[PDB]
Write an enzyme that holds these catalytic residues in place. Structure first.
Site, PDB file in Angstrom:
ATOM      1  N   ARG A  44       5.254  16.818  -8.245  1.00  0.00           N
ATOM      2  CA  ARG A  44       6.615  17.182  -8.709  1.00  0.00           C
ATOM      3  C   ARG A  44       7.243  18.405  -8.059  1.00  0.00           C
ATOM      4  O   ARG A  44       8.418  18.348  -7.673  1.00  0.00           O
ATOM      5  CB  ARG A  44       6.662  17.321 -10.230  1.00  0.00           C
ATOM      6  CG  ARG A  44       6.387  15.984 -10.901  1.00  0.00           C
ATOM      7  CD  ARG A  44       6.199  16.056 -12.423  1.00  0.00           C
ATOM      8  NE  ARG A  44       4.990  16.795 -12.837  1.00  0.00           N
ATOM      9  CZ  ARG A  44       3.787  16.229 -13.006  1.00  0.00           C
ATOM     10  NH1 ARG A  44       3.601  14.933 -12.800  1.00  0.00           N
ATOM     11  NH2 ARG A  44       2.778  16.957 -13.437  1.00  0.00           N
ATOM     12  N   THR A  88     -13.391   3.712 -14.854  1.00  0.00           N
ATOM     13  CA  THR A  88     -13.728   5.074 -15.267  1.00  0.00           C
ATOM     14  C   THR A  88     -15.217   5.010 -15.578  1.00  0.00           C
ATOM     15  O   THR A  88     -15.642   4.173 -16.384  1.00  0.00           O
ATOM     16  CB  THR A  88     -12.935   5.397 -16.584  1.00  0.00           C
ATOM     17  OG1 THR A  88     -11.532   5.332 -16.296  1.00  0.00           O
ATOM     18  CG2 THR A  88     -13.250   6.810 -17.082  1.00  0.00           C
ATOM     19  N   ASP A 136      -7.772  10.539 -22.524  1.00  0.00           N
ATOM     20  CA  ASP A 136      -8.049  11.563 -21.500  1.00  0.00           C
ATOM     21  C   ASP A 136      -7.073  12.721 -21.698  1.00  0.00           C
ATOM     22  O   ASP A 136      -5.850  12.530 -21.703  1.00  0.00           O
ATOM     23  CB  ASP A 136      -7.853  10.914 -20.133  1.00  0.00           C
ATOM     24  CG  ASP A 136      -8.334  11.767 -19.000  1.00  0.00           C
ATOM     25  OD1 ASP A 136      -9.283  12.574 -19.234  1.00  0.00           O
ATOM     26  OD2 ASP A 136      -7.901  11.610 -17.834  1.00  0.00           O
ATOM     27  N   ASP A 181     -13.074   9.926 -13.700  1.00  0.00           N
ATOM     28  CA  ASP A 181     -11.821   9.170 -13.922  1.00  0.00           C
ATOM     29  C   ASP A 181     -11.254   8.733 -12.581  1.00  0.00           C
ATOM     30  O   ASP A 181     -10.356   9.349 -12.045  1.00  0.00           O
ATOM     31  CB  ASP A 181     -10.844  10.044 -14.665  1.00  0.00           C
ATOM     32  CG  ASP A 181      -9.570   9.305 -15.100  1.00  0.00           C
ATOM     33  OD1 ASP A 181      -9.519   8.051 -15.041  1.00  0.00           O
ATOM     34  OD2 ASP A 181      -8.596   9.967 -15.534  1.00  0.00           O
ATOM     35  N   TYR A 200      -5.987  16.885 -20.522  1.00  0.00           N
ATOM     36  CA  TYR A 200      -5.394  17.425 -19.303  1.00  0.00           C
ATOM     37  C   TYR A 200      -5.587  18.945 -19.381  1.00  0.00           C
ATOM     38  O   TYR A 200      -4.698  19.720 -19.035  1.00  0.00           O
ATOM     39  CB  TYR A 200      -3.883  17.071 -19.344  1.00  0.00           C
ATOM     40  CG  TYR A 200      -3.065  17.301 -18.088  1.00  0.00           C
ATOM     41  CD1 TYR A 200      -3.587  17.079 -16.797  1.00  0.00           C
ATOM     42  CD2 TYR A 200      -1.728  17.680 -18.205  1.00  0.00           C
ATOM     43  CE1 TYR A 200      -2.764  17.245 -15.653  1.00  0.00           C
ATOM     44  CE2 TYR A 200      -0.922  17.821 -17.060  1.00  0.00           C
ATOM     45  CZ  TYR A 200      -1.443  17.592 -15.806  1.00  0.00           C
ATOM     46  OH  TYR A 200      -0.575  17.730 -14.726  1.00  0.00           O
ATOM     47  N   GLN A 255      -0.507   5.467  -8.918  1.00  0.00           N
ATOM     48  CA  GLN A 255      -0.150   6.387  -9.986  1.00  0.00           C
ATOM     49  C   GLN A 255       1.226   6.985  -9.819  1.00  0.00           C
ATOM     50  O   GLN A 255       2.024   7.012 -10.771  1.00  0.00           O
ATOM     51  CB  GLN A 255      -1.238   7.456 -10.086  1.00  0.00           C
ATOM     52  CG  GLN A 255      -1.052   8.407 -11.206  1.00  0.00           C
ATOM     53  CD  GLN A 255      -2.134   9.424 -11.320  1.00  0.00           C
ATOM     54  OE1 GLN A 255      -3.128   9.385 -10.618  1.00  0.00           O
ATOM     55  NE2 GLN A 255      -1.978  10.335 -12.310  1.00  0.00           N
ATOM     56  N   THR A 312      -9.587  16.710 -15.913  1.00  0.00           N
ATOM     57  CA  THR A 312     -10.244  17.130 -14.673  1.00  0.00           C
ATOM     58  C   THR A 312     -10.575  18.601 -14.697  1.00  0.00           C
ATOM     59  O   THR A 312      -9.703  19.449 -14.975  1.00  0.00           O
ATOM     60  CB  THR A 312      -9.353  16.774 -13.493  1.00  0.00           C
ATOM     61  OG1 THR A 312      -9.178  15.338 -13.461  1.00  0.00           O
ATOM     62  CG2 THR A 312     -10.009  17.099 -12.142  1.00  0.00           C
ATOM     63  N   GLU A 369     -12.227  11.993 -10.284  1.00  0.00           N
ATOM     64  CA  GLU A 369     -11.890  13.168 -11.108  1.00  0.00           C
ATOM     65  C   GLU A 369     -13.114  13.567 -11.888  1.00  0.00           C
ATOM     66  O   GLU A 369     -13.635  12.804 -12.696  1.00  0.00           O
ATOM     67  CB  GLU A 369     -10.763  12.857 -12.120  1.00  0.00           C
ATOM     68  CG  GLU A 369      -9.377  12.811 -11.481  1.00  0.00           C
ATOM     69  CD  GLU A 369      -8.270  12.617 -12.532  1.00  0.00           C
ATOM     70  OE1 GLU A 369      -8.570  12.152 -13.666  1.00  0.00           O
ATOM     71  OE2 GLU A 369      -7.131  12.983 -12.205  1.00  0.00           O
ATOM     72  N   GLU A 405      -6.810  17.312  -5.173  1.00  0.00           N
ATOM     73  CA  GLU A 405      -6.797  18.757  -5.042  1.00  0.00           C
ATOM     74  C   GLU A 405      -7.559  19.338  -3.860  1.00  0.00           C
ATOM     75  O   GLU A 405      -7.015  20.225  -3.173  1.00  0.00           O
ATOM     76  CB  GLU A 405      -7.320  19.384  -6.352  1.00  0.00           C
ATOM     77  CG  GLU A 405      -6.436  19.063  -7.575  1.00  0.00           C
ATOM     78  CD  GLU A 405      -7.169  19.419  -8.850  1.00  0.00           C
ATOM     79  OE1 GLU A 405      -7.126  20.609  -9.314  1.00  0.00           O
ATOM     80  OE2 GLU A 405      -7.851  18.516  -9.328  1.00  0.00           O
ATOM     81  N   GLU A 420     -14.791  15.016 -14.842  1.00  0.00           N
ATOM     82  CA  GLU A 420     -14.502  15.329 -16.278  1.00  0.00           C
ATOM     83  C   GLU A 420     -15.788  15.318 -17.088  1.00  0.00           C
ATOM     84  O   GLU A 420     -16.854  14.870 -16.638  1.00  0.00           O
ATOM     85  CB  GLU A 420     -13.517  14.278 -16.855  1.00  0.00           C
ATOM     86  CG  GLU A 420     -12.314  14.104 -15.945  1.00  0.00           C
ATOM     87  CD  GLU A 420     -11.117  13.479 -16.627  1.00  0.00           C
ATOM     88  OE1 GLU A 420     -10.909  13.725 -17.866  1.00  0.00           O
ATOM     89  OE2 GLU A 420     -10.362  12.714 -15.993  1.00  0.00           O
ATOM     90  N   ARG A 442      -3.988   7.273  -6.400  1.00  0.00           N
ATOM     91  CA  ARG A 442      -2.905   8.250  -6.471  1.00  0.00           C
ATOM     92  C   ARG A 442      -1.571   7.713  -6.029  1.00  0.00           C
ATOM     93  O   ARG A 442      -0.542   8.175  -6.534  1.00  0.00           O
ATOM     94  CB  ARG A 442      -3.214   9.570  -5.732  1.00  0.00           C
ATOM     95  CG  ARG A 442      -4.496  10.248  -6.188  1.00  0.00           C
ATOM     96  CD  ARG A 442      -4.456  10.569  -7.677  1.00  0.00           C
ATOM     97  NE  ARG A 442      -5.549  11.500  -8.022  1.00  0.00           N
ATOM     98  CZ  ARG A 442      -5.689  12.036  -9.228  1.00  0.00           C
ATOM     99  NH1 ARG A 442      -4.843  11.679 -10.248  1.00  0.00           N
ATOM    100  NH2 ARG A 442      -6.670  12.906  -9.437  1.00  0.00           N
ATOM    101  N   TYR A 464       4.273   6.147 -12.797  1.00  0.00           N
ATOM    102  CA  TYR A 464       4.014   6.952 -14.005  1.00  0.00           C
ATOM    103  C   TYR A 464       5.190   7.502 -14.740  1.00  0.00           C
ATOM    104  O   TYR A 464       5.030   7.929 -15.866  1.00  0.00           O
ATOM    105  CB  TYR A 464       3.022   8.092 -13.756  1.00  0.00           C
ATOM    106  CG  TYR A 464       3.594   9.361 -13.232  1.00  0.00           C
ATOM    107  CD1 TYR A 464       3.850  10.462 -14.056  1.00  0.00           C
ATOM    108  CD2 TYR A 464       3.996   9.430 -11.920  1.00  0.00           C
ATOM    109  CE1 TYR A 464       4.412  11.623 -13.547  1.00  0.00           C
ATOM    110  CE2 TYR A 464       4.560  10.562 -11.380  1.00  0.00           C
ATOM    111  CZ  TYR A 464       4.762  11.676 -12.205  1.00  0.00           C
ATOM    112  OH  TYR A 464       5.355  12.813 -11.713  1.00  0.00           O
TER     113      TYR A 464
END
Ligand SMILES: [Ca+2]
Ligand SMILES: [Mn+2]
Ligand SMILES: [Mn+2]
Ligand code: NA
Ligand code: NA
Ligand code: NI
Ligand code: NI
Ligand code: NI
Ligand code: NI
Ligand code: NI
Ligand code: NI
Ligand code: NI
Ligand code: NI
Ligand code: NI
Ligand code: NI
Lengths: 416, 418
Positions: free
Chosen positions: B144, B259, B128, B235, B130, B242, B352, B201, B366, B203, B239, B246
């Protein structure tokens, strides 16, 4: 207990009996065998001798070009196969010893055999379960006070690897090209990797799956561990460092990963089980197990460069160092309903002990290229040179015999 | 325009301009086998394989007898082009050969309505990417912080990670809300329980054709020769699992519980009429990632959500594949630059697909801005993340004059956790 003689220096006494896929000049079709002494016992030749309840209707798994279907039969079948082999080699069931026509078709020299990947690996995962390895990477990259990240002592951290580039021992590995950023104040560059590394690991193969959406409870995790191989997770550290934030190692790992061909079954390793390392903090209940599942396996890595006449041992370490067990890794990997499949490969992480002589990568042995490693004959290394050959070996020491893993070897080819 | 003897509605996903490949079985015949969608029918390629008499296919007709598309994908572009031209001829309104063979039509066609689709290929490895600048910016802010939300490498290489191949499932497969470990309270140890931030997600993904040899990069000028065709992908993401797991090795259990892909593989030749110039990249990429060939596609994408109580599914995202910053050619080139060996049937997903307009953000992480904004899903009803019983459907179409090239559905319903 074996009519086939076994030398004292053999990796393959009667107490081992690992499974592999091999071929010969005379018959190039890959097929399943079992190592004993310096011989291979061809299981497609002797498939009819597995007459027990778990295997009598499933002898066809021994005619396959990979171990996947045998792995997927599960523990009753594995235990029956090993007992049948033990009873044939002791001649308690004398058919193989006494049927000369069968016997001469069934045994071939390892020296004359070519080994193949033991399974079609659907998914490969690499864990990170050596506390000293994670701590060292942390000290080197993030500093002493930040050596271990907050999640590490709580779950067995791991990432999905690349299955396609897992290759059998002896496969040459080309130094990869890629993107790196040697000067943080400037744009990245394209070129040959400069920091080519090895990683000492072990790995296990998964037996029966679990169904999609159905976790494997830790109580049952031992039922899904078929057996183990040696692994070298070749790494390109400069490519890795540039790419890996935030989605993890990618091209820094995927140009090659080598495994040894002989899969040593868990029942062969159980005599070498030791207590599990004390975990503090205690893990969540889903990860808890009382069963000892840590193993005393002596590991060594040698390096021999072009021009050098003798290989130097650069690492001596032991699988018993690992903080998280294979049971915990398997269970965590399926906790969310992920479906593990027969022949999946789950690797331990780089195996470093606290003694610097036991650090499992040249990133660690050279401390990020700040310390030269003595490799003998006036030669030194930080990272691997073109033409260097790395060989990993592993042995369990019994009373008067050793259960060995054969070799996990590769030579570095120049970038092209 | 162009017409088949098979009737095709104007807005059908499957006009003669499409001709996607899939693996199906029927109530009459459980063997999974290769078909091509046309109108509301499937043409069984195993039945008509002897009609592929051209040079690329005449000695390789057995690829159409397989239970998966891998071997046909592996044959490469001359074979794909020959199959497509043969099918365009055979299905043409003006061609008698199949049209007028009543008994052959009886054996060769079956209705989509009564077919069961299977995964189109055995996926050796799934990656996958990004590659949406807005999606990467958004997740950077939410996980972050705004500072370096787009991290230093992102404009220099197509960032990606290895995904879990085993848990790629075909459209319609129910997805159970995963259990796992999470750390909802930073002052407490982590806990074990059901995921609380279950997400989708949007995709797309492509399947690899011929591979490259171990140790041998695919140069960017040849990357187009290795891309067979595309599907839609969801996907599914957990969260909370994750975010805890991660650092530093990447998303893992937060992705690998499921998925979904759509089953009909739309070949690149079908999508080329919808190609557009590639977005400008600044900074300019390194030469190995530099290509002039247009390889950005105008594909309108939509995501709907229908709760277990609802009669109308709500459209929660409208986006377009043309928003992506890195092309498939760049993704495939980068994936092989180190000598990694791509193999037929491997799946490389786009990332995504978020545009800059919030109505085009491709995940509920999002659209809800990590649970701080309600998503309108119909009179009175809202979501932040997915609830048990919610069904998410992704659709996609390229719009031509009087026809579309559509992708069918990429659907899944959320089952309650254990
Ligand atoms: Ca894989
Ligand atoms: Mn590793
Ligand atoms: Mn994704
Ligand atoms: Na590697
Ligand atoms: Na997923
Ligand atoms: Ni030995
Ligand atoms: Ni027979
Ligand atoms: Ni049976
Ligand atoms: Ni803690
Ligand atoms: Ni920059
Ligand atoms: Ni003793
Ligand atoms: Ni026309
Ligand atoms: Ni449609
Ligand atoms: Ni040919
Ligand atoms: Ni448009």
């Amino acid at each position: 207990m074996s009519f086939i003689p076994v030398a004292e220096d053999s990796d393959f006494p009667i107490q081992n009996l690992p499974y592999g896929v091999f071929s010969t000049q005379s018959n190039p079709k890959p097929r399943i065998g079992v190592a004993i002494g310096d011989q291979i016992l061809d299981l497609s030749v002797i498939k009819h001798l597995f007459t027990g309840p778990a295997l009598s209707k499933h002898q066809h798994v021994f005619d396959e070009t990979t171990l996947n279907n045998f792995m997927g039969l599960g523990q009753a079948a594995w235990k029956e196969a090993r007992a049948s082999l033990q009873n044939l080699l002791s001649a308690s069931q004398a058919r193989l010893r006494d049927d000369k026509e069968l016997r001469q078709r069934a045994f071939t020299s390892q020296a004359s055999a070519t080994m193949h990947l033991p399974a079609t690996i659907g998914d490969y995962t690499d864990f990170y379960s050596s506390r000293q390895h994670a701590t060292n990477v942390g000290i080197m990259f993030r500093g002493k006070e930040n050596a271990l990240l907050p999640n590490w002592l709580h779950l067995p951290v791991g990432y999905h690897g690349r299955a396609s580039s897992i290759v059998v021992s002896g496969t040459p590995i080309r130094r990869p090209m890629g993107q790196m950023r040697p000067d943080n104040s400037k744009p990245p560059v394209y070129g040959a990797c400069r920091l080519l590394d090895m990683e000492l690991e072990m790995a296990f193969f998964v037996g029966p799956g679990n169904r999609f959406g159905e976790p494997i409870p830790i109580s049952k995790a031992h039922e899904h561990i078929f057996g183990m191989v040696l692994m070298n997770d070749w790494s390109a550290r400069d490519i890795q460092q540039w790419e890996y934030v935030p989605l993890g190692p990618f091209l820094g790992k995927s140009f090659g990963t080598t495994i040894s061909p002989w899969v040593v079954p868990m029942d062969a390793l159980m005599p070498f089980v030791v207590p599990n390392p004390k975990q503090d903090p205690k893990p969540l209940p889903y990860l808890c197990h009382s069963q000892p599942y840590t193993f005393d396996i002596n590991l060594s890595v040698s390096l021999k460069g072009e021009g050098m006449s003798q290989a130097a041992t650069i690492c001596r370490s032991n699988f018993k160092h690992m903080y998280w067990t294979m049971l915990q890794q398997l269970t965590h990997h399926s906790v969310n309903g992920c479906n593990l499949r027969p022949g999946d490969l789950l690797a331990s992480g780089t195996i470093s002990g606290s003694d610097p002589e036991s650090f499992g990568s040249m990133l660690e042995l050279s401390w990020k290229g700040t310390k030269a490693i003595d490799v003998g004959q006036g030669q030194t290394r930080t990272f691997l040179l073109d033409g260097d050959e790395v060989i990993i070996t592993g042995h369990c020491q019994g009373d008067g015999y050793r259960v060995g893993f054969g070799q996990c070897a590769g030579k570095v080819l120049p970038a092209l």
